[PDB]
Design a protein around this ligand. Sequence first.
Ligand SMILES: [Zn+2]
Lengths: 89, 114, 101, 50, 69
Amino acid sequence: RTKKVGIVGKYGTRYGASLRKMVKKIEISQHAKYTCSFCGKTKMKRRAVGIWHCGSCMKTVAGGAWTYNTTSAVTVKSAIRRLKELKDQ
Amino acid sequence: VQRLTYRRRLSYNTASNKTRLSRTPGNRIVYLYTKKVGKAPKSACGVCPGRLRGVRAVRPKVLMRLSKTQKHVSRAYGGSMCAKCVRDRIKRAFLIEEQKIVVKVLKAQAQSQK
Amino acid sequence: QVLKFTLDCTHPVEDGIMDAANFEQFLQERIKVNGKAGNLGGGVVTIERSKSKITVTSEVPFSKRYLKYLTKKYLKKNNLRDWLRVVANSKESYELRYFQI
Amino acid sequence: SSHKTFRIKRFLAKKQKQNRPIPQWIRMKTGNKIRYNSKRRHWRRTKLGL
Amino acid sequence: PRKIEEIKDFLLTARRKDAKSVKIKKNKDNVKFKVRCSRYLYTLVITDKEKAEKLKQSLPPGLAVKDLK
RNA sequence: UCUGGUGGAGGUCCGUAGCGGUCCUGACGUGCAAAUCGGUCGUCCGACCUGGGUAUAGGGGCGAAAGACUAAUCGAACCA
RNA sequence: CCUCGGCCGAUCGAAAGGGAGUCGGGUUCAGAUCCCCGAAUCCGGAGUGGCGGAGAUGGGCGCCGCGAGGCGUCCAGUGCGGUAACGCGACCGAUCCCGGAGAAGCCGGCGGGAGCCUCGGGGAGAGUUCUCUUUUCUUUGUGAAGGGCAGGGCGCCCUGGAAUGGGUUCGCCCCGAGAGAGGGGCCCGUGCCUUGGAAAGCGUCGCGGUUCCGGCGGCGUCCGGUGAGCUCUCGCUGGCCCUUGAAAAUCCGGGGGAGAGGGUGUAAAUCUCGCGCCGGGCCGUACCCAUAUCCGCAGCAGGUCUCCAAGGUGAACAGCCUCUGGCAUGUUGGAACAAUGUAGGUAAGGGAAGUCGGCAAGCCGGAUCCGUAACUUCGGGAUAAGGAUUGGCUCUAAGGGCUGGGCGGCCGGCGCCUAGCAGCCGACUUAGAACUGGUGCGGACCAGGGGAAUCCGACUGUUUAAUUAAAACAAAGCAUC
Ligand SMILES: [Zn+2]
């Protein structure tokens, strides 16, 4: 239907092309449904900013503002596991 | 077509001014003020989205003039918890207690042998 | 399953302002079965008279309000609506009466 | 309005009872100076202190 | 209003010390026996005229009887 | 990749009720009116319109800012 | 006197938030869910048990009794059913603890129910009848609270194990964390029948007394069909949010088991079950609610918060005409039809030559079918621009629903619905054609003139109430402290 505007066609011409391009990436990720790591079903939607809910197993997870997992979160979780393992062994 | 008027001094379409149409034996259409819709209890588990079964969906103050059988289900945690989560807590209680006996025996046997 | 409807004209004929025989031919001619006037619908409907009591019998669906429509047209044609009115005196009969003061 | 308090109703009752014309025999009293009720109040013309 | 479907229950209701009057009504199809008590008006619907006349004879004494004619 | 459907987004468009008030520099201008009237106009799912209840009081308040508004009174109200 | 015990603090704050429980008929000069009649209901109290029912009345050992059924002794009994979801009329229990309800946004789309509108018949009354019209108009009920049954919904249960994946919605969406299929369970039930209930109300036709008798009587208050129709409401399911859309009184359920009851009576504690008895005090309530009961000095073209909402045309709560209901032209009338004016029109031939300036007016305007440029942030610009059609009448084609498939049944080979056949029912449109009028037809009403450019502001929004709506302010974004 569109060549490049995608999901930000709802804004028409009403903001800059670059601002619509930046929000295009974020609006795709904030409205996507992800696969739940707990039940395996692709029903992990966003309730509010930082709140992600699964409509099958009814699990609520604290995540990112627009994406389910922030890169800072993954690095910190991997680093804490390394620091914990160094303490134990 | 006959047009209607409020039967009370509240002239605003509020949540406590809801009405329905009734035809009288005098062949007139009048307003009847309706009670709010009640809701059945939600399970104490906190994970089940649906309401409980076997309990009347009435407003809370009317609940005290019903019999007890209309307010509960014949089961442990009857009118407060769903059957599915009652089943899960029976198994969760039993299996954790089983693991505790196993752990205590394992640590007692290890202590005796060491 | 037949329908019997009667018409009372006793008062108008006693006063002499109404002709019962003229009513028979008026209903015989200006009457419709399946939307066609005359012939009494191939003999399905029939009209009889006895002492100013015109009875109409039929087996097909026939409504007596249709007869009230026909008798009113007869009265208007004869300039009698100013003294006579058609009143249902029973479930299956109409009667011609005068207007009181 | 129809919805009114007891205090307001009793206040309106008093103003209603004192809105009457002077009696006729008062004019006949010795040394009388009153000819009419000069404190008559009309609802549309003058409004109450309330 | 309560509907009673048994003659035996109707006689028990009529002989209550609470009962005030028995109102008999005749309709085109049935006869209705109505006993007025403190809380409810108990109605018994009988479709047989033979049983209807029997009920009138067996009505308890002293209780007021009114025929809705 | 193209095509035909479905779908129903939007401080989206036309445009009622509502909110506002462009131009006629029209009417009126000892007026219907100490700011109103008509035609024509702007907006009309949103930074929307609105009742009641609450809070802020005069060198103070409040101000998407005009020295605007603060009971027909505002480049510091009104009362004594 | 021990034991328990957080007020996480008095109190005030809503006649639109929360908040148990009433609705039909009649009655006034003015009242009325308030009075009368009738039928219900909530809360509180009942101690000295108000009456029933439940708890709760079994089993073993013997003896007598022909045997049934009784005598003695011993032991039970804070109910019962369903695999389950849960069900049954009750079905003890404190401090303490957990939970629920009260208690949640806005928008969209579907579906159920009702009211209203509509269509086809049957009654009763009325209108028209110059000619027709079996016509046209009116009217054609069953309150709350109980009982039953439709109907709607369900992330509720049992069997079972699915790929050649299947189920399914307008859209989606769902499934080895258990699909489809079959069978159950629960909730809501404002719908229908029923008690209430026809005795009342209404319609119509008569008969009385007298100003009123809720007078008396007869007949009726019937049978159907439709729908993206409008409104309300109940559901289901989605979209949006750097916005996530009250609190508290009040009521309930559960966990635990400190306690209480009685020894086998016809019994006890206890009972959220059925019926019975008594009470519910204080204040408001008339009327206007606005082109005349409010504010603006007034019966002031101003201002002032809501509810219900028929027919036709038509996209419409548009405008225009009409019904129910309402009114008397808006603080006067009569006569005349001068100038000037206010408001509404028209105009030959030119066509902005007027004027600071096309100000004002005029042109265009709806829908269908074609066709649409520069530029561009690729979304738009766009109803760009430009063109054709449009009435009336008579036809044609297409677009659906239900039932059935060899006196009454049925033990049966004997039948084969299979290019979907027959019968019955039904509403709204679309396309094509012929004919036809003095080429007139979105015939009134409603209803964008357009194009090429320059300046400013990005856009939506806001602003000097009463002379400035703008380029001014704000705004997202950018940057700094
Ligand atoms: Zn999950």
